[PDB]
């Protein structure tokens, strides 16, 4: 018998992303190539497949650095990073083969299906 | 607010 | 130029809660008289006045044990923390009065409000 | 996925 404010998920991934923005209780620096991301954990888990294997390991779950493979893309993933926060996804004709190449990766499974289905119209 |  | 997807703020919100129903990357304990209740910081800031306060604050932000004011009631908050997770509120007659208390003490705008309509109604 |  809950009631439900609309909402809520929205304004909290908002926060999530000012408290990003503002570098605010950010625990994990994501490598890609000479590139260096600052995020939660806990949101790059809830968004990515391959995130939530690395931290649920009883090891992973520990470190500060995280290094991708040295295929990933560093603007692929800023784009599916901002994704991950917001649920907006640049996506570009310049951008969509590294940004599904990434998602891929990453496991974002919503993500391939729309890069799929944009790739399969052009 | 609604009825979820 | 972005494409959005709807379920996104949902979907992180929802593996956000799973996360804590199995208690991973939790990193705090608050703390409502002889009760405890295991939370995400971001999660707890992001929904609340109070907490933002709180881990904002160059020395409370390193703090695994957060105390609540004694006149808060331990069920009242456990309704709080969960509508904070699921977006869900279990407003019922028995708890309505204690569920406004807190959530006025935790600077949670929205749910006062609600709490302030059903009264008035009532 | 829309047009936000
Ligand atoms: O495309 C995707 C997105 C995604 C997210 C997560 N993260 C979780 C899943 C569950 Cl069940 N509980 C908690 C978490 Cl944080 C796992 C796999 C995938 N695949
Ligand atoms: O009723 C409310 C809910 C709420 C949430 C937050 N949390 C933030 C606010 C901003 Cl601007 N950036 C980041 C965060 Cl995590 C502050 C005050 C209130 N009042
Ligand atoms: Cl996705
Ligand atoms: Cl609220």
Redesign the interface.
């Known amino acids: 018998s809950c009631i439900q404010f609309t909402r809520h998920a929205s304004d909290v991934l908002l926060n999530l992303n000012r408290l990003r923005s503002r570098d605010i209780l950010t625990d994990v620096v994501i490598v890609v190539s000479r590139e260096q991301f600052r995020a939660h954990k806990t949101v790059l888990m809830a968004c990515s497949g391959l995130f939530y294997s690395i931290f649920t390991d009883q090891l992973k779950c520990n470190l500060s650095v995280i290094n991708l493979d040295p295929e990933i893309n560093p603007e692929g993933f800023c784009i599916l990073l901002d994704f991950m926060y917001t649920s907006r996804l640049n996506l570009r004709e310049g951008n969509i083969m590294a940004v599904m190449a990434t998602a891929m990766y990453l496991q974002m499974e919503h993500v391939v299906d729309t890069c799929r289905k944009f790739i399969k119209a052009s | 607010?609604?009825?979820?």
């Open positions: 607010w609604v009825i979820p």
